[PDB]
Structure formats: structure tokens, C-alpha cells
Design a protein around this ligand. Sequence first.
Ligand code: FAD
Ligand code: FAD
Ligand code: HNM
Ligand code: HNM
Ligand code: HNK
Ligand code: HNK
Lengths: 425, 425
Amino acid sequence: MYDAIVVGGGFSGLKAARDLTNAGKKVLLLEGGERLGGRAYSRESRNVPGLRVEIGGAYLHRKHHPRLAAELDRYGIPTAAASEFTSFRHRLGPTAVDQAFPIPGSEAVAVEAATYTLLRDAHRIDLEKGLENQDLEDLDIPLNEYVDKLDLPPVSRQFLLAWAWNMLGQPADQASALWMLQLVAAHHYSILGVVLSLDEVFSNGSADLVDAMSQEIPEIRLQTVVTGIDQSGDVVNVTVKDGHAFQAHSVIVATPMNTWRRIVFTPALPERRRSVIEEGHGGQGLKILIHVRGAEAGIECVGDGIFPTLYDYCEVSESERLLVAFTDSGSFDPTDIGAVKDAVLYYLPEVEVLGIDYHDWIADPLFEGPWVAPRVGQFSRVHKELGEPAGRIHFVGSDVSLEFPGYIEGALETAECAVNAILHS
Amino acid sequence: MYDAIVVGGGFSGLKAARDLTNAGKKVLLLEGGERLGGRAYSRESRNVPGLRVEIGGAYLHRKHHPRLAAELDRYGIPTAAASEFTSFRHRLGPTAVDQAFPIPGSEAVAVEAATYTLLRDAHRIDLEKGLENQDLEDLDIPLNEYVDKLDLPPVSRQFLLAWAWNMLGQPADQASALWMLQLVAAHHYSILGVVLSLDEVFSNGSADLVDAMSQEIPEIRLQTVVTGIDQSGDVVNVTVKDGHAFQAHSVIVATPMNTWRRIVFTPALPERRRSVIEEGHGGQGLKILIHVRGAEAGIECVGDGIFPTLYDYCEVSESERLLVAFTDSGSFDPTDIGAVKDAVLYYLPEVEVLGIDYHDWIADPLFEGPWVAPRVGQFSRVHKELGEPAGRIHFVGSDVSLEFPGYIEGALETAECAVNAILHS
Ligand SMILES: Cc1cc2nc3c(=O)[nH]c(=O)nc-3n(C[C@H](O)[C@H](O)[C@H](O)COP(=O)(O)OP(=O)(O)OC[C@H]3O[C@@H](n4cnc5c(N)ncnc54)[C@H](O)[C@@H]3O)c2cc1C
Ligand SMILES: Cc1cc2nc3c(=O)[nH]c(=O)nc-3n(C[C@H](O)[C@H](O)[C@H](O)COP(=O)(O)OP(=O)(O)OC[C@H]3O[C@@H](n4cnc5c(N)ncnc54)[C@H](O)[C@@H]3O)c2cc1C
Ligand SMILES: CNCCCC(=O)c1ccc(O)nc1
Ligand SMILES: CNCCCC(=O)c1ccc(O)nc1
Ligand SMILES: CN1CCC[C@@H]1c1ccc(O)nc1
Ligand SMILES: CN1CCC[C@@H]1c1ccc(O)nc1
């Protein structure tokens, strides 16, 4: 038997398992798949042989993300500034300006006012309490309705909705305004910070840190899918798809929220939690790497396209590049290459699409989702609860972070909490 | 005897006297000087013969200033867009950008935050109540201290303080933060609107409207300085520097606040009012028209100069122009032409100063001040009261407007109030 079993080998699981190990505990980490790192997934390009790409999480900001910064410093892991953008090719209408902040002067007053309104709303949110414990229900409404109340003129209206489509992985009519405001809160109550936190990448890929962390973890089982967690006895029993059970005093669930519904918990999880767990969150984020010819370097495009954002990712050669597009998988089918060409040519009519690369996170049974975003009405019913212990079973992950949800920093933050909870026992 | 005597023939007095006349009242207007229009003063340039200039109030915005808009439409008075600015020559340090909004991206987050803080503060202010009736005392502190609390980085810090020096006619250490916030409130709670309301000028000068209004006023006495207002009897008696007294049921004081202290009121004015009336406000605004050679058209400069602002005013010829500078008369001596040259050359080292033109509003015994600005601590003690009736004696003027203080619109607004008060009697 173990002091602790950690279920799931993303950053959250890895941290928990390492930190518990180093505290002198006997830890087992069970990972269902063939790799560690979870939604942090560097690998070779499908389009360009020998090219290493990030197919999930990539970007960080040392100052919004201090735990991650610490990890990077700990292992001497190199980061670099993302390629700064020099060419702006927006589709925000004829009054827009082609720079990084594309709002014209004629909109300045409206933006000023909307800025005050948004930040005043975000300031209603205390990040410690949970979104369900703060009388925030009036904000838990479709983002398109919230934004209609702001009565923004067209460039700023469309610019705000494009980055919110990007950031949430949801179209405006499925996104919750409260959740948008939560992201604002999470970035020291800054609308601007939401985009500015896309500051740096791993020079050598996220696997750098994955590998550094795992090397400190003594017991790991890959291809071990947990199907059962049973704390009806004195010691927790963890059953597994094709193997013998494992036992521990404590279990950490460090798997994605939208997979919890596939595990049988005994006893059943607290009732307040059950519906949302069954529903899942509504995150439909879709990140497409696009291999292209004819693109100048340093392009950034924001607009009203089916790709709200399209921007430079990496130089492939003197004529070729990868770009990255964000949309959502409800709205867009990345396997329809004619659709990809149309969405790119909308911004960049001179560019030829050579291929795309993505991961279908939503179809992956180890995930059933990209990053977290609630359906309208979910997180004002239940939110903080989702990341609280049920007896000896802890829940961690980016998905349940109050502080940094949907970011790597959130995976680290939740793990930190569970480790400490456990070490006091 | 009259139904009403109006004392002072600026826009406030003119409106009151006209509107009362048209209501069927018997009105006398007494003006102490040789002209009508008061701090709206078009005249021929001291520097350039045949050139008509505005030596006080000039700028308006039809949408912030609806009464003024109505007056212009009433008499068919033509306005034009002020010369839009195309050349920016700021002194805001090396990270500043030479455009109308000079804040660099590196400051964007700080500006966002400060914007929220300022507007949240301005929103404490209800424009109807008076600055003394709202528990705003914590804001009634030197602007430099308030701004130090914002902890702004240099370009935005200096940009904000430059326009506030301009707008208030006071250096940061004599200006009240509460008053700055009042100007913000007055512009539909917009920091930006404070500057954007410099939208248009009178095509033919402010005298256009002065003359249109006065033509509707049947009894006017120029060179008639009021020295006494006595409402101890049943009918008000108004005594005058060199002449027989005049009598009326009602008197409107439409003279500048800083001149009230020279009139003997009988009985004495309500005690709450007396100290501030004796002090006067601390407005030291100073507007200098500068005749120059070598200046390109469309210049605008904001910076940390003894002139916080310096901008284009009018084309004099192909080589010559007028610019306008704002500073304050405590800080700067406009009769020291070597000082003027230094202050211009700081922004514009290629420009030759040929002459300056201004009016010493502060030395003018008919004014004793430019536009209103309170000393720190004044208007949180007494403010609304200054513009309230004392028995049969009304107080109007830009100086006492809650809605639009220091603007022409405020002169119209206060007059409107007094007229209506009187017509209900
Ligand atoms: C397209 C995309 C782009 C992103 N971009 C960024 C970004 O730029 N910056 C950033 O900070 N974040 C980014 N992220 C979000 C961030 O990457 C994730 O929220 C974070 O990595 C999640 O870490 P975690 O440990 O909570 O979960 P995961 O990384 O999901 O780890 C969960 C582990 O559980 C395993 N598992 C599932 N079921 C079982 C089972 N029953 N038994 C055993 N194991 C199981 C899975 O294999 C997985 O390894 C992105 C995510 C996606 C999808
Ligand atoms: C340099 C400067 C620039 C300005 N720029 C602008 C601008 O761009 N836009 C804007 O809207 N406003 C501007 N103004 C502010 C605005 O012009 C004034 O607040 C406004 O015109 C005041 O009108 P009023 O009727 O209250 O008083 P005033 O115009 O001051 O009229 C007061 C009248 O009382 C007379 N008087 C004084 N004592 C007596 C006495 N005892 N008896 C009889 N008469 C007396 C004076 O002669 C005067 O005619 C500016 C002002 C100045 C000084
Ligand atoms: C460099 N930090 C964000 C700058 C502003 C911006 O618009 C942006 C968007 C995406 C990205 O990768 N980098 C920058
Ligand atoms: C044109 N309206 C204000 C534009 C912005 C500005 O900085 C400004 C300042 C003075 C002035 O006369 N006009 C404009
Ligand atoms: C997918 N989200 C989750 C955290 C940050 C990441 C992301 C990365 C790039 C981008 O353009 N938009 C969002
Ligand atoms: C003197 N203030 C009083 C109202 C507006 C006026 C003014 C005019 C021009 C300028 O640059 N600053 C202030």
C-alpha cells in the first residue's frame, strides 16, 4: 500500500507526486496514457518532419505564473519570448487600425467606459470564495448578451468578442460572461493582461519540464487507466482497467474534469457536484497549427472570422511557416481543409495553406475536452466544491483552479493545495 | 424700479436678462466694463493687426454643451472644427509616442488600472448635491499626492499631470484632486472627454453670440460698477460706483466669484459662504497666444514644460502662426519674453517667438481671476451654497455651476436656474 496514489500524469499529478515523494511519502502515480504531460503535449509536426511543436498548452508569463517560474528556475529550463508581432492583418472593419491595439480614436470614449464597466464587474469577484458563493448569478449569462449591454462600437466590440472566443474556446452565445470576468480577475483584474500573459514559450518544448519532474518520481505506471476509486473501507482502493487494484491512504484525482464521470466513486461524490460532473464543462477550444507558404513573418490577425485569431507560430523555411489559429470544435471542422483555407484566406488572401496539425482533445477519452470553460449557469451553481476533497479523495488540476483556471499555473496551484492538505494528516 | 437687476454682462447675465425680458419682466443689466461678454473676449491681436483672436474662452463641444448648442442654432452662429492636429512634438520622455495618445504599450496595463481607479473615484460624485454634501473630503487633497497614489509610469504620469495643469490653471501641488474628479464627472464621467470637449470654436469669435444676445436686451448700462446690494428694505437697492442707485424686486449677481468680496451685501451673506468668498478660489489659469515664425501647421505638444501644453491656434501667413500655451500665473510670467522663448523652444527648438498676447484676468478688477478652481479644502467645506439664493439675491455664473464649472455652458446653466426660480414668485 501507498501513502498516496496520484491519478493522472499531467503537471498537476507530477507536482503532487514529486512533492509528496520529497516529503518522505510513499507515492504511486498512475497515468492512463503512453506519455506524461497530459494537455501539455510537445511532439513532432504532422506537417513538417523533424519540427517540434506544441499541440496543447504552450504560453506562460513569469509574473502572472510564479509557480511555473519557480519550476523553470529549479530545473534550469530555458524560455524565450514568443515571436513579437510586426505585421497586423485584422478584419475589424475599415476604421480599425493595423496595430496590436487596433481601436481607433473615434472609439476611445466608448472603450474607456466599457473598461470601467468590465473591471467594476470583475471586482465583484473574490478569487478565494468560488463563483457559486458570491451572488454572481446575474453575471452568469451568455457573453453575447452581456456584451450587448456594453453597447460597444464595431471595432472594439468585435475585437473584444474575437479574443474572448479565442480565450474561452466558446462562441459568444455559449460562453458565460461571469467566466470571462473570472479570467479578468485572475489576471490581477486586467482585461489587457488576459492577452499579455501570452508572453513566453518553452525553448525546447513543455516536455523539458515534464521530463525534469518525472525524473524525481520513483513509481510510475503508464497505460494504467483508473476506473474505480472506493473509499468505503479504511484504506482507499483504486481499481484499474486491465490490472490488479492499488491501495492508499489518500488518492489525488489529477485527471481532467470531463473524465471524472467515467470513474465509479464509492461512495458516490457529494450530490451538489454530481450534475455538473455528469454534464461536463462546455470548453470547446480548438488550436490549429497551419503549415503555410507565402506568409511574411510576424503576422497577427484578429477579426470576425471563423478563426477569431490567426497568428505567427514559427519559421519553417524562407518561404514556409506555421501559423496558429484558435476557434472552437462546435463551430469548426479542422478536417475540412477547404474550410481551413477559406478561414485563413479571409485574413490573408495571398497565403497558401499546405497542411494542418491539431489534437482532437474532445474526442480523446483521456480528456474529453480541451481547457475548462463552464456552460452558462454551471459555475454559479457549483464551482469551488469541484476542487474540494471528498473524504480521502482529492481533486486537483487546471480545471478546478480558482486562481488560474485553464492555465498550467493552475495545475501547479491546485497540486500545492492537495499536497499541503495531505501533509497535515 | 425693475422686476430684476442683472449685475454683470457675460454670458450668464446676458442669458438671464434676455430670458427674463422675454418672459415679460422689466429688467436692467448693469455691466461694470466697456464691453459685454466678460471672460469671453474676442478682439484684435496685439501682435498681428487685423487678426481677430480669443483672449479668453473659445472652445465648445455641441454634445457636452447643449445649451450653448441651442444658442448657436437660435441665432445661426457658425462654428468650425478647431484645426485638427497632425504634428506631435511631446516632451514626455523617450518611450513616449508622438501621436495624440502618446502612451506606449509598456504602460498599457498601468493605464488600464489607473483609469479604473480614477473613474471609480469620479463616480462617488453626484453632480446635483454639491461637493460639500457628499463625504468627499478624503479626495480634497493636493493633486500631486492623489496622483502619487496611482503610481503611474512616466509617460502617462506626466501626460495626465500636464493636461490637469492646463485644465485647472493650477500646478499639481495647489490643485485639488476632488476638483479634477469633478471635471471628470462633468464630462459624463470620462477622463478622455475632458480633452475631447475642445472640439470647436466660433468662426467669427464669441462676440457673434454676445452681440446676438444683447440685441434682445433693452436696458443696458456699461461702465456701471456695482458696489452695494442691500435687501434690508422691501425692495432691493443696488448702489453703484459713480451714480444713482437702482432698485428691483430681485437681483442676479452674474459677476465672477472672486469679485463678490468687493461688493457690500446687506445684510451680510450667509456665514458658511463668507470665508471662501473672502479667500477667493485659487484659479490661476494663464492662456498665452504666441506669434511665431518657423512653425509647421497642426502642432500639438504636451509635456513636462513650464508650458504643459503648447498647440496650434491659427495660420498667420505662410511662415507665421499663432500658437497657444496654457500655464498658470503663479508659475509663469508672461511679460518675461526670454522665459516665453525658453518654454516654447523646449518643445520646438526650431521656432522663433515674434510676440505674445494675453489678458491678465487676475489683475483685472472686474474679474480677479480666470476660470474657477478651488484651493485644496475649499469646495468640500462649501460649494453648492455659493450658487444658492440669499433671499432676493441670486448667484449665477460659470464659477458656481455644479454641472459645467469653468465652461460657457455653466454660465448658461446657472442663468437658466435663476430665471426659473424668479419666474416662480
Ligand atoms: C489546445 C490547448 C492549448 C493550451 N494552451 C495553453 C497555454 O498556452 N498556456 C497554459 O498555461 N495552458 C495551456 N493549455 C491549458 C493547460 O495546458 C491545461 O489546463 C493543463 O496542462 C492541465 O494540466 P492538468 O495536470 O490539470 O491535466 P492534464 O494535463 O489533462 O493531465 C491529466 C492526466 O490524466 C490522464 N488520465 C485521464 N483519465 C485517466 C484515468 N482514468 N486514469 C489514469 N490517468 C487518466 C490523462 O492522460 C492526463 O495525462 C492549453 C490546453 C489545450 C488543450
Ligand atoms: C483664459 C480663459 C480661457 C477660457 N477658455 C474657455 C473655453 O475654451 N471654453 C469655455 O467654455 N470657457 C472658457 N473660458 C471660461 C469661460 O469663458 C467663463 O467661465 C465664462 O465666460 C464666464 O461667464 P460668466 O457670465 O459666468 O462671467 P463673466 O464672463 O466673467 O462675466 C462677468 C461680468 O461681470 C462684470 N463685473 C465684474 N464686477 C462687476 C461689478 N461689481 N459690477 C458690474 N459688473 C461687474 C465683468 O465685467 C463681466 O463682464 C475661459 C476663460 C478664461 C479666463
Ligand atoms: C507579447 N505579448 C502579447 C502581446 C499582444 C498580443 O496581441 C499577442 C497575442 C498573441 C501572442 O502570442 N503574443 C502577443
Ligand atoms: C479635436 N478634439 C480634441 C482632440 C485631442 C486633443 O489632444 C486636442 C487638444 C486641444 C485641441 O484644441 N484639440 C484637440
Ligand atoms: C488555451 N488557453 C488556455 C490558457 C492560455 C491558452 C491560450 C493560448 C494562446 C491563445 O491565443 N489563446 C489562449
Ligand atoms: C480654460 N478652460 C476652461 C474651459 C475649457 C478651457 C480650456 C481651453 C483650452 C485648453 O487647452 N484648456 C482648457
